[PDB]
Amino acid sequence: KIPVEADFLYAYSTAPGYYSWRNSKDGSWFIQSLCAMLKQYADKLEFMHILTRVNRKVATEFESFSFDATFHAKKQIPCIVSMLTKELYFY
Amino acid sequence: KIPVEADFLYAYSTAPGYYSWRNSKDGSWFIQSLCAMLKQYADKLEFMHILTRVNRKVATEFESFSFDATFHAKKQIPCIVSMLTKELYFY
């Protein structure tokens, strides 16, 4: 007999209420940094631990660029939401 | 130059939209299991990793008990929300 909302996990590209940035060329900030980590790390680390550098690698090395006073110079931060009940290691 | 919503962390006692259970005697499910983990583990594990058994230790070994058809036999699941950009080890 266990909770039904558990074992879930939501790793959002951005935090609540904000805009999510995607590149007209390469692809979503969050989405690339993601695969990019799951590439080097999906066999060394955990998952949440993996999800944190994703965030790191998007808060640190990314930034918006535009002609619109309004959209120029903006950042992003993903959001890791977990209802999981155990760690996860892909293997 | 970094995101302002990052480095945050919200570990809720329950998931979005649900009720949170607390004991008229011992204390909040989530709150005890919490200290209880930070007790044994705050010097062995990480933090998120620590937050997961909290969830585990509340999804597994806890359950509501009442005379009200309506509140009897219910579960809980905490919610770990992280905008942190690095792991955390208390020491």
Add this chain to the structure above:
Amino acid sequence: DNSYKMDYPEMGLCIIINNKNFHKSTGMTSRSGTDVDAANLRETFRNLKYEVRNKNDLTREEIVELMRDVSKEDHSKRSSFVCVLLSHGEEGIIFGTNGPVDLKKITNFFRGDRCRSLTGKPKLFIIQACRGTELDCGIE
């Protein structure tokens, strides 16, 4: 144990729903490059034993079916369920190629008692879209 069980004869089923060309009536801008993503993810989860199935430009009343279809499936022998989404959106919402839909009545079909085979198995929902309309100026 502390770590999840990940060694069933199948590792998973990774469903990436790439949405990009929005019906004009919805007045929804296009998503230049989702494909790069969808293509990258498609490869990233293919590299770890996942039956990935990329579906594109589906409608809200298309995405749900898909789901209701996926949740009603024997997953008895599978170690997880990854469900990448790609589209636009408002908080809690999620866009189909005609109009909005609610993130929650999506995830529901997997909720403990709903999707049984997937009980005690990680349901990972990666979502790549707008969660409202604030801007992050940053500092330091």
Add this chain to the structure above:
Amino acid sequence: DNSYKMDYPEMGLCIIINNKNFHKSTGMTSRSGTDVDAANLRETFRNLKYEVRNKNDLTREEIVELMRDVSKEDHSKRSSFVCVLLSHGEEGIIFGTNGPVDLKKITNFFRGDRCRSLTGKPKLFIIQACRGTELDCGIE
């Protein structure tokens, strides 16, 4: 590095706001046992070098001040900020001893550009309260 910086001359400042006796007018039930918690947490974070300060039955227009007071403080030499909350509530909301308050305009005072000293430092907000009113029947 991958791990956060945790070795400043001070480890932290753990603010536990225990709320329990709600003004009758608000028609808010009481919280039988928060104290056990508040007492347990108070000890749990005292055991790891945190200046814990337990404040009780504060009002929404009391909690904010507290905050605005805490965020306007030299934390230049401190490794983190834990902010346990204990009360009742609705989603996003959080109750004072007179009426609701919003979780967000609380956390704001720490937001990158607001609370500077606390930039690149973990702001942990543990919250123990209701997030709405659904019931979890469970399964298996």
